[PDB]
Design a protein around this ligand. Structure first.
Ligand SMILES: *[C@@H]1O[C@H](CO[C@@H]2O[C@@H](C)[C@@H](O)[C@@H](O)[C@@H]2O)[C@@H](O[C@@H]2O[C@H](CO)[C@@H](O)[C@H](O)[C@H]2NC(C)=O)[C@H](O)[C@H]1NC(C)=O
Lengths: 120, 109
């Protein structure tokens, strides 16, 4: 029988021991520019969120880049998404509350063959 | 201004903006590997692994003049800390391969 730290009723205790909360591999990498389905990043700052740096990707093109560097629109650039947890800080007044949230991040794009439909 | 090292949260996880066959249709295809951890929330995480070193060309064959590379993302997970305790957690940062993209070996001019 092992001891547990005290947790107030109807709560969850969260230890945030992460050093460099906003450190991202996307900063030094340039695969977003080298990709056949290239993408852009939009970076926003939210001081009431952990992590505070909000990074979203957007596909640059409809189609995919070929050998010549030209768009082949018979192929699709599609965004790929990842679910993550965030901590949101809420203020009523000077009173502060914290909550866990699940968010979706568009991390980049890939090049896929299209799904084809027919009329009849 | 900064978030404290330790916070109390309520029992509700608020879903924001949440809710396919790309792993096969992509010119940089990948395989998904299951990572299960009962001490972790989410307990199951799917990890992408690029199927080839090269990319698929117009003919459907592997072109090694292009590369399949992972798109990796830093995500936050919950780890029960101490492991046997139900309501105390460590917010843990992990690097996950979400999928793969096709890249030219250098940025082209
Ligand atoms: C994607 O972003 C471009 C902006 O150019 C980027 O600049 C650098 C940061 C680098 O990453 C480059 O490779 C990128 O191309 C957007 O293009 C601009 O759009 C404005 C209109 O809003 C236009 O006036 C500018 O001339 C454009 N600049 C360039 C260089 O093209 C582009 O619209 C973004 N695409 C999407 C879909 O959001």
């Amino acid at each position: 029988p092992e001891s547990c730290p005290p947790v107030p009723g109807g709560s969850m205790k969260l230890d945030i021991g992460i050093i460099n909360e906003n450190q991202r591999v996307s900063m030094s990498r340039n695969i977003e520019s080298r990709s056949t389905s290239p993408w852009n990043y939009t970076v926003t700052w939210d001081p009431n969120r952990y992590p505070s740096e909000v990074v979203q990707a957007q596909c640059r093109n409809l189609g995919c880049i070929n050998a010549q560097g030209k768009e082949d629109i018979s192929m699709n650039s599609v965004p790929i998404q990842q679910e993550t947890l965030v901590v949101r800080r809420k203020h009523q007044g000077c009173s502060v509350s914290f909550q866990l949230e699940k968010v979706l991040v568009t991390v980049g794009c890939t090049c896929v063959t299209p799904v084809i439909h027919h009329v009849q | 201004k900064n978030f404290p090292r330790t916070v109390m949260v309520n029992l509700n996880i608020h879903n924001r903006n949440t809710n396919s066959d790309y792993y096969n249709r992509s010119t940089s295809p990948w395989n998904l590997h299951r990572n299960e951890d009962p001490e972790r929330y989410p307990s199951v995480i799917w990890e992408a692994k690029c199927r080839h070193l090269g990319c698929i060309n117009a003919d459907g064959n592997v072109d090694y003049h292009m590369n399949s590379v992972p798109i990796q993302q830093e995500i936050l997970v919950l780890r029960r800390e101490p492991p046997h305790c139900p309501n105390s957690f460590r917010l843990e940062k992990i690097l996950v391969s979400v999928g793969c993209t096709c890249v030219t070996p250098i940025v082209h001019h």
